[model samples]
Target chain A: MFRVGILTVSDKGFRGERQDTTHLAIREVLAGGPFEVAAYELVPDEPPMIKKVLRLWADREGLDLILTNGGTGLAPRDRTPEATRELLDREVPGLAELMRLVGLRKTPMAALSRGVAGVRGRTLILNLPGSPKGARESLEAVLPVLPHALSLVTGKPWKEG
Target chain B: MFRVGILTVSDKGFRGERQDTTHLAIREVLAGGPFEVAAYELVPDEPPMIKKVLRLWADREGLDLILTNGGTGLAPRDRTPEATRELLDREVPGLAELMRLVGLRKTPMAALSRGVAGVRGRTLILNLPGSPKGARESLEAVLPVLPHALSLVTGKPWK
Candidate 1:
C-alpha cells in the first residue's frame, strides 16, 4: 500500500474564508483501496509555507507521494510549482510538458499553466492548477503512469519486467 | 504497426571508417515485435545532416518514431538533440530525465549527457548518447514506456 498526501494552496482556504472544492475532489479520487490518504491541509500562496508543508510531510510523515492542487497557472499568485521546485532535488519536466500538450488539446489556454512534478528524497510531488476541471484533466493525463512511476522511484518491481 | 526509423550519428561511421554498431543494435531491437524498422541511416555528427535526415524520415516516410544514437553528450560535435529540437512541436523530458537518474546510480559521468526527446507532427524523435553501452542502457531505461508514449502521440492502440 502507498501513502499519499494532498495539499491545496489557496489564500482563501488557508484564511478559512472559503473552502477549496478541488482539494475535496482530488482526495475523493485517491481514496480507493490499496492507498492511504496520509495527510491533508491547506496553505496560503506563499512559496515558503508551501515548501515547509512538503518538507514536514516528507520528513516526519514519511509520505511516499504528494499531490498538490492549486497555484500552477499564470495567475500572479500562482506559487505552488515554484515552492515545489525549490524543495525538489530534480525536476520532472515531462509532467508539465505532457500535461500542457494534453491540456492544450482540450483548451488552448492550457499553455498558461506552469505546474510541475518533482522528486525530493524518494517522495514525488506534483503541482496542479486551482481550477477543478484543469486539475482533473491534468491528473487524468498522468494517472496511467503515476503508479508505475512511483514504483520505479521506490525501487519496487516494475510490471514491465 | 509502428514504423520506427534508426539514425546512427557518428563521424567515423559516416565516413566509412567504422561500423555502425548502434544502428544495427537499434534495428535488431526494433525487429523483435510490435514495431517495424522502416528506414535506417548512418551519418556524421553534423547538426544539419541530423536535422535533414530527421525531417525527411518524419515528413516523407511518415515514421512514427525516430531513434538516433550518438551526439548527445558533452562533446563539442554532439548536437543531435539541439538540431532535432528546433523542429519539434512538444518536448518529452521524462525519458532523458529518467535515463540520467538511472545512469547516475551507475556512473557519475552520466550527468554529461545533454540528450532530449520530443514529438513533431505525430512523430516522436529521440536522442541517445554515443557509445553502444550508454545508448543501450539509456534505451533500456526508456523502452518500457515506449509503447504507451507512442500510443499517445500516434493515437494507436497502446497494447
Candidate 2:
C-alpha cells in the first residue's frame, strides 16, 4: 500500500505541443509493484516547476515514492537531475547506477541518461529516462529495491541510503 | 600527458597512526593510464581540507584529473562525496555509474559507496572506495572513459 506520485516533465508536453503519455507507461510499471497512484501531473522541464511539485508532493502530499520522467539528459535545457538534487536530503546513487547498468545492455544511449534518485522529507524521488521504453526499463531495474528502500526511508528514524 | 592529484581521506592516515599507502595504489593505477602524478597528500576526513585541496588543484594548479579515495561510505562522517559535489561544475553520472556497475559483481558492498564523479573547471574529479582494492578496481572501471572525458572536457575554446 505505498503511495506514489508520477510526473512527466517536458516543455513540449507542458506547452501542449505533444500529449504526455509517459505517465501512462509509468502506471504500467507500477501495476506490477506495490504502488498505488495517488497523484499524477505533467510540467515543463523548467527547474522551478519541477522543484515546486516535488516539494509539495514530499512535504505536503505525503507520498512515499515519486517517479519522474523526462529532462534527465545532456541537452542544454534538461535539468531534472539538477532540480531533483537540489530538493533531495540524501542521494541514493545505487538506484541511478542500477538503472543505467541494465539499460546500457540494450542500448548505448543508456549512458546518456543523467538521472538521479534521492530522499526528500521521507519520500524517495527517482528520475527516469524520457522515452516510454527507457522509462519502463529503468523502473524495472530498480523495482526489486523499492520495497526495501521504502521500508528504510519511511521508518521513524529515517534509514537514508 | 594528463596531470593528476591524489588524496586519501582518512583521519588515521592523517594522524600518522597508519601510513597512507592508498596514494601509492593510485599512482600504480595512473601509470597504466596516461597520467603523471603532480600532487599527492593525505588529509583527515574533514570537508574543509578536502575542498581546499580540490579547489587548488582545479582552480589554481589546474590539474586535469583529481582522484580521491576514502570518505565515500555510509558512515556519518563520510563527507567526501558532499565536499566533492559542492565544487563540481558538472556531474558525470556515467562514470560514477560505471564504477558501481563493475564493482557490484565483486561485492554487493559496491552499491554502498556514494562517491561521485564530475567536472570542476577544466578538471575531472573522481571519487572511489576507501579500500585499496576497491579503489583500484573502481578506477579501472572508469579508466576506459577518462581519455575521452578529458578530450571533451579540456579542449581549446575549449573544444
Candidate 3:
C-alpha cells in the first residue's frame, strides 16, 4: 500500500554516457516488495533539475516515498542534499546519522557523505550515496522505519504500540 | 548558544479581546533558560500573517528556532499547523508528539491539541497549544532534545 519514486541524479547517466547501477539495484530490491514504485527517473546532477524533480514527486504527484542516489558526495557537482533540502520541510538527521554510523563500520569514507533525509508534506525524501553498494546498504539500514516515518509525516495516527 | 523566536497566534489576543497568557508563560520559561529568546510577537490566527512573521524571523533575521503558541486546536480559526506546514521544509512529528505526551500527564485536553513542529532552513519552528499551562508543560517535554535538534538544522558541527 505504498507509492515509491526512485530518482537517480548523475550528469553522465542523464546524458547517456553511463548506466545507473544504483537505480537498477534499487529496482531489484523493490521488485517484489509490497510497495508500488510509481515513477522512476534519471536526471542530471544539477541542483535546479534535482529540485524540480523532487517538487514534482512530492507536491505534484504526491508520492509517499522518494529515494535519490548520486550527487551526495563532496565533489563540486555533488548537490543532491542541497537540492533535496530545498524541497524538505525538516531534516531527519537521526536517519542520516544512523546511516553514517552503519557505514562507519565498514570504512571511514562514510563521513564524506552529505546525504540527507526528511519530510515534504506527506512525502518522505532521502538522499543516498552514489555507490550502488552504499545505496543498498544505507536504504536497508533505514528501510524498516520508512513506513512508520512516512505515516507520521502525513499526520496519520501514530501507532500506539 | 541558540536564538529562538516565540510567536503566539491568536486573533482574540492580537485584537485585545483576550489576554496572551501563553506568550508570557513561554517567555518566562525561555528567559529562565540558557537559550536566548531572539524575537517574540503575537499575531492574528491567520495563515498568511503567521507565515509572514515566521519567514521574517527565520529567513531575514536568522533565528535558530521559533516556537508558536495557540491556534493548534479544533477551533474554526486554528491554522497554526497549516501555516507552519506551508513554510517548513521538513516536519518533526516528535516535537508535537512529545508535546501531547507531556501534556497528557497534566491535562486530558492534550488529545484535542493539533500543534505541529517543522524546520525551515536553519530554524526549527514548533507549534504549542494556546493555554499557558499547556505551553509550559509541552515545552519542558521537548527541551531536552531541542539543542541537539537545533544544531542539526543549522548544520553546526556538534561533537
Q: Give the TM-score (0 to 1) of chain B in model 1.
A: 0.91
Deviation from native of the Cα of residue A68 in model 2, angstroms? 1.2
Instruction: State residue B146's C-alpha deviation in candidate 2, in Å.
Output: 4.9
TM-score of each: 0.56, 0.59, 0.52
lDDT of 3 by residue, A1-161 (tens): 56889998888884546666898778776655446799999888888888898998989999888989887754446778878887889889878754443323443344345688898988988887788887877777776776677777765443322
Model 3, B1-159: lDDT tens per residue?
788788999999999998887877887777755578888888998999999999999999999889999999998999998999999775665466667753233555766789877678778888988899988877876775676666666755333
Give me the displacement of residue B63 in model 1, in angstroms: 0.6
Whichever of 1 and 2 has more lDDT, that candidate is 2
In candidate 3, which residue ranges exceed 4 Å CA deviation?
A1-161, B102-107, B156-159
Winner on TM-score between 1 and 2 is 2
**Model 2 lDDT vs. the true structure?**
0.82
TM-score ranking from best candidate downward: 2, 1, 3
Please provide, for model 2 over A26-102, each residue's C-alpha lDDT reduced to its tens digit, 9 standing for 90 to 100.
Answer: 89987856678999888887899999999999999999999999988655577899999999999998898766754
Clashes of each: 0, 1, 6
Look at candidate 2 and give me any clashing residue pairs: B155-B158
